[model samples]
Target: HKLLVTPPKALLKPLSIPNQLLLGPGPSNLPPRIMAAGGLQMIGSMSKDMYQIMDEIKEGIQYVFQTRNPLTLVISGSGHCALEAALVNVLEPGDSFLVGANGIWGQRAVDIGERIGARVHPMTKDPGGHYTLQEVEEGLAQHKPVLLFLTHGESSTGVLQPLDGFRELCHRYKCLLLVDSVASLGGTPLYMDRQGIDILYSGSQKALNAPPGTSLISFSDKAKKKMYSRKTKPFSFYLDIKWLANFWGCDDQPRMYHHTIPVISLYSLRESLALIAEQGLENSWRQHREAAAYLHGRLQALGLQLFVKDPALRLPTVTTVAVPAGYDWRDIVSYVIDHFDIEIMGGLGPSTGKVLRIGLLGCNATRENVDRVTEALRAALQHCPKK
Candidate 1:
């Protein structure tokens, strides 16, 4: 018997999706207006309309990061890509870097540094923990590395590393400071220029309420000079900032040809940035702070424990909650998805199945959604036989 293969006919099904209360550690809920804007027509990357969108997005990124660096632009991939670009572009082979490893993201930075042939030195803490500002300073002094990497928001432990004096330390030692704001940016007060951040990168899916395809990065003039002085070519073709900067027209000179930019994702990013502008950036930070406090209160009321005991060290965006004894963390997460159609993430890397990470980002950080997550968590806990 001969089997005939053909493309499957498409079926028209009802296009109705349940309103999910997003309380996870990324890809937060989008505002209704932003959602509507995403449905608009697509434009080519080089088209006039698309370039205008790109220009708006560039300004929006500058506004969000609070920097005046002309080298600022969003990468085509997520937070990791931005990070790689910053590290690879600035440092060549044999250059040394110091990483403050307080969580999974910090460890990932070490990995990336090593992959790029930089001598990576890590100052790490135990899982679900953080390091002191003094300790970070000592690490920099000890290493005297060419670059320093730190994650502003350590989602694995819910620790927001203090940034008050890190830049001073780095500058004193002639080391460039790179911060990963992937999980913090819009939800926290991050003024790149004010904070002396030489290089900073963030993801759109978290606090920006955009899809997870773009990574926003800002490079100070100092960082750009270091990148241009690299002895060897960048390891990554896609992330080479020298060429990417030209395409982004970060310099005052004419734009140079590089790779094609992702036009649709850039459009969505522009809409998200517009929403941020309308809401006001500082107000957005306050909203996340208030919502996170409410979430912490509710979680504590339910007998659940928070990973970060020090309030001063916690990030306003992502919260990591310890599971009650004998409860399968994955089961509770699965139950939440199955019963409520809401998604909350389990832990990553070392913290996997050990804690539940709840993200209060952008439109997700609301009183109504917080109450829903609290209620759902209670219901899931009640069903566990061990509880």
Candidate 2:
């Protein structure tokens, strides 16, 4: 009875992790700076030095996110945590929530909204399509929702949903606009404040070049007011914006012990943000776009069709190619993994089995790497069995 839970036999063996080129939807490869930061010595979460680091992170987030929202802070969780926190804090029982359900991120928001006891109305299209301004306004006018959810980067289908004029349309309908930029934050152009996005959140794993553990979220004043005046408490204590504000010193009151912070991951995040600041957001975005253009050309030359037909709508970070007609998508993915030590992925949700996804994010967004992945795909297509 004292030790009923015996250790698993797998624990006895030394860990063996094969390094592969991560060219998939997320948790992209980190640079040397970010990797080294994670290996640094740890410190107490509540120390003054840690607080200083938090402040520095806040500033870095503001630069990367292009927002001056005072409520900006880091979450000790993944991008999904920020998604849940953003939704639960403002939406309540019987509230109307409109979600742009073209891809997995929007579908996830719909699920979260329904679980929060809200009336969810999803403005859905096929996986690779995006909602136009008129379409979004139509949804808002019909649903009359308190909040609208859109994915700035729909990774599942590689559609970069345009945010221009969306916030204005939402505000015209008296709704808060929440954008999920987990995949597009640094690789694409997004102006959180200028675009009037009420709530915006992203992950460290994508274009930030950090490991996948922490997330960044910021709330506009309108979003803040909605949360502050909510009649019911947020569904999650750990994700409550009020407590999080205090924890991150976004509020006037002194911070109380909330939870043990992941100090090392924060260090990694700090270093990644510093790298972004040094590289400049515009340069990063341009590089990604250029690399994607080259990859798309290469794929087209190989007779592979892109999933998203509209060049203007394609996501630069993650590219989706229609599964070449003659071969199964799985065989191609497996071939790349087994032979080339590369990590290309198949689709998710509605795009499953229909597309092959290749992501070139952060430090991996280079012309040479693009050439490498394109060559791998070419080889995979040549060797894999044709259906």
Candidate 3:
């Protein structure tokens, strides 16, 4: 038997795109300035201009995360990449960890921990729910885990798991805390130093309004000490914090090259961070909160029920609504997309077909857009055929 191989061919094509209402979990619409920056000149990773851009980005990220950790850098992928890097780099074989599993992202941490040979103790809650500080402390006491992972904003259920006093609890147990802020950063109020978060990670696509492919991460001294003490080399070369820290300049020595970062994505991140700086992080959080309030008010006015009953626990950037009886969730999503060019997302894992997730992140979290999406949803539900 002979196998045939075809030569690769390249061609240029023009595409027309519509302005979409991106009311979903993530990859929210980019601001015009950030998109414009993507079209700017692309330089090699080591170019002087690119390095200056990176430095500016580093300072901007420091402002965004509200941290002074010198080990801060952008991981060259999505939010999950940062999460994986944090877990895989800090942990070694046989290490025990505790996870507050209230949504998909926390479950993902547990899965990654298991894959990395760590004993994962997950303190889980029901869908559209969250774990309390007391519960987290109990898990830490029971597991005596070396590390504890939590998601500040669980996009899967639109729940902002409480962070108040969590850092004290972890420190009391001598456990380092890792937080996934992909869906919360910029859209919510998060101060890594103040919150006592040892390691923090977030993506540029959601609240930053940058295109996907870049993740922002910061490490506290406590996490750095753990990384310095790793017995074995990190399981994955790309995720090794020692190398990344060297490249990002956590040490006094000259910077070492680990990998070539995506230059265009880095530029977009710089512009996005500038946008956040201009808005002021606190004002940005307030904007998202106001937008969510508008969304909830309009949704309730249209007779839709929210999945999360307590507003305090609900995430301001993503709103998960209960699917009304006698209607097809997909149809509602489809109708909105087909007729209105708006895109709302569905639930993940156990909540599938039972909830609709509406995203209000970065530029998409505006009163005007919220009203538009609510109106579209109302119209779609009104015209839907009964299941």
Candidate 4:
């Protein structure tokens, strides 16, 4: 049969979407300018204009990540794909990988590493819990892995794993450090070069306040060495960094057609990163930290117990609140979403049914917004079914 040219009725109809205040995990409502940029003119991926914007994205990523690594760029997919690309590029078919599995992100890392042919050993804690420097030191000592993988912020449980001594300990054991910053960057202080992090990957949608689709990934000289020295081709051709690097202009060479770069999405990324650059990384960190502190304070005033007992360990970007004693968790979530048009998610992975995951993403991470969500929480609890 011949291919038909047609359009769906839905496509012909005007786009109508509800104004939702995204306070859940990622894909936060982008700035109006970024949204506008998404509707701008399209261009070929290899065009000079496109490459210029792509390079700007690289610089923006480096500034936020606080890295001097030249091999930084956005993977043309979601955070999940960026993470998979990380695993397959360096790991072959049976390298020992030590992972810290405190929440969903870490657990997934372990799973992905195993799938890509690594002997995975996970050092775990209960969900809503995090690891300590001493514990990481012990794990690194025991496993002596080729790579030690961990998370900066575990969104599932609102736990931020400490990286202070982690790099030193990893290096002590002659292990490379790979951090999953998908839930942490922009909301917290992460100086990659100063911290000695060998590799880091994060999502652009979360703290960066862009739409989801493209993710940021960077490799140090050390990580690059390990990548090129791989004994076998990476599991996925698309995930191969060598080809991607050339296309991204990470290598000093002419660009080749890799894939159809998400041209419009790149516009959104550039606009969002431009906003971040203007705000400055330190100020962005402070904005989120302050908003979260205020949110936590107000929630505590409502007698809601936080999932993370330690304020120091709680991730500022995503916070988990315990389900009040008399309330049905699902009912509270439904009440909030229905009445307020705000998203307050339930726990993920091991923390399921135990806590509500509240994300204070870019632009939405404000004192006023925090107070609004706090009021929404109060309303949900007042209306939810009691035990």
Candidate 5:
């Protein structure tokens, strides 16, 4: 009756997690090796073994991103953590920042920028849509911001934004370009140094096939100079890039401490990266693209429609399907999960109630898995889509 009662049977019972096929926007299922990596006894945070592991992780990130920048690292939090770390450190009070707010992530940057004393020029668009490079150039001309933010994959809308001339456009106006690659990084082609991106950041749980909490982040020399020249130090002490870089041994380093590093998380990320290396990054990219196309075909075969119409604009990793007018999207989602143990999701932001988001991430981006999900949707729809 009191708080001193014996443990409840719920807590005493044998633990078993529902192992679902992660078909939502992120956090795809991890391979057994990567899962077991976290269970390994953790090494001392500042020990030489940990340092070597950190160095390997850093190099692995560069290899995956195809960037030669020495500043490559994994921010010790989620993808949004990298965004906060970058904006706080690089932008000062009264700084002008432009956010191409086509989808949710872009809007996040606008919201964050305004809160941090930045003059925000947000180029917004309808949901399930993305902006053109011309629109970004127009914002750059009108606002003349010090920094520009764009999302490579609008996960909420399943839009893959074109970034061909973005760097040149930003450089033309002496502005820095920061790309949100949280949904697109390993699944798509993004040559950081060759593409001239000033700052790039992505998540571990998406296309990387890793556990959450690690964000792959890199800053070009140009961006570093801007950060180093900030008139005021960054607001968040834990997010200070210089401090993080020192601890990660990314720069001229005596390997000082910013905080206690997450040893187990790093171990998992290393295993994830090792998987990528063995598979080869380019091969991974093509596999994701092909898997997405097959899934799209299967969705169409079920007499459904795709939310993103333009083939080139579609984000392969996160595909959105239109909810027919007579059907309840959530009902179908529930049926699939209840029957098949797969995560089927409805849309977000403006796309909410209009579409369903399906993620084909990393190891899950295979033909057989795609078929499994497609068949599950087919079975669920057999009882759904009625008046």
Candidate 6:
């Protein structure tokens, strides 16, 4: 083939990635162990060694998710990939899908269902609000959906949706309960089996202390049964649960080459999971809770208000501070990164401009880091001009 187009000059330059203390909602900075894990040499996707790593990853996920499901596996993509995978496998065209829309994640779930040709009904609440069990039951009774989606941690507003009684409520109406715990999983306490969660998914980048682009997903026996008996194949061949289950050796079938698994990323995930194993899940949860409370007090001392009014509802992984009276939210967000190399961010979706988001997850969730971010915020407030 003759060269018909000029190559971009940008490709000739050396690659560059700036270092920053990631205090944003997701993708908290990875620690030494995980970075070392990702640097290891590559391997074949279908090799026995690769399967061994996958097995470790599965057990790690089960431990963090507190589930005994046989279909536990890691997806080779982000949290959004697991979200779409969960929806497509269970919901078919014309099927009723009910979603709890309190923040960006929930809102995105509703959109995915609509794209799948499902009749979607969104049980919406304002940002920083969560649905009561009674309210959720009303939707279940009305929509009678095949799947009900809820985000355990609403990063946009920093609300933690209570999962207690939700599974029983969903089961009463024969609906599968799918929870997005991308921002919560290890940092927050979630017992999948006791909570009766059907399909639970979380991201590696958040509280798991790993690099982005890998996610953990597990389906209960009930959820697997529904997906296996579906009348239609899932909308995406790459996301087909049956095929994926086999690839992960969950279906007890001879393994086939489903796709090229991201071996390096899985190594990072494996190491992060090992870190959690070394530190008990209860201890990790306690660390996040204490760090968040410390940060909250520091923010209040600086005269900043919290977005989620009820302290119990606040998400420990992400803390949302209400925009101060006379300052633009952008100015503070910009000042922190520019001056201190800290990556605190502004609000998202419905909460945009109304709040400032700060995350201290996994390795980042420490009292020392809380002091650093708070000091950065104090300096930002002093330097940035009042709007």
Cα lDDT, all candidates:
0.85, 0.91, 0.88, 0.88, 0.88, 0.92
Per-residue alpha-carbon lDDT of candidate 4 for residues 1-387, written as tens digits (9 for 90 to 100): 875976787898898988788898766878888889988998977899999999999988888888879899889999999989888897778888888898888788899998887989999888877777788777777777888888889998998877887767777888888999988988988888888888899988998888889999999899999898877888898879999999998998899887888999999989998999999998989999999999999999999999999999889999999989988899998998899998889999989999998898888889998888999999988878899
Q: What's the lDDT for residue 266 in model 5?
A: 92
- TM-score, candidate 6, is 0.98
Q: lDDT tens string, model 5, 259-304?
A: 8877999999999998999999899999989999999998998898
Q: What tens digits encode model 2's per-residue C-alpha lDDT throughout 18-68? A: 988898988799899998998999898999999999999999999998988
RMSD (Cα, Å) for all candidates, in order, is: 2.3, 1.1, 1.9, 1.8, 1.8, 1.1
- Relative to the unseen true structure, what is the C-alpha lDDT of residue 351 in candidate 3, on a scale of 0 to 100? 72
Model 5, position 182: C-alpha lDDT score: 89
TM-scores of all candidate predictions against the true structure: 0.94, 0.98, 0.96, 0.96, 0.96, 0.98
1-387: candidate 6 lDDT, tens digit per residue: 999878889998999999899989978999999989988998887889999999999999999999889999988789999999999998888889999999988899998999999999999888999989999888988888888999999988999989999877887899889999999998789999999999999999998989999899999999998899988877899889999999998987899889888999999999999999999999999999999999999999999999998999999999999999999888899999999999988999989889999998998999999999999999989999996
User: Which runs of model 1 end up more than 4 angstroms from their true locations?
Assistant: 1-19
Candidate 3, residue 384: the lDDT equals: 92
lDDT score at residue 272, model 6, on the 0-100 scale: 96
TM-score of 5: 0.96
Over 4 Å off, model 2: 5-7
| C-alpha root-mean-square deviation, candidate 3 | 1.9
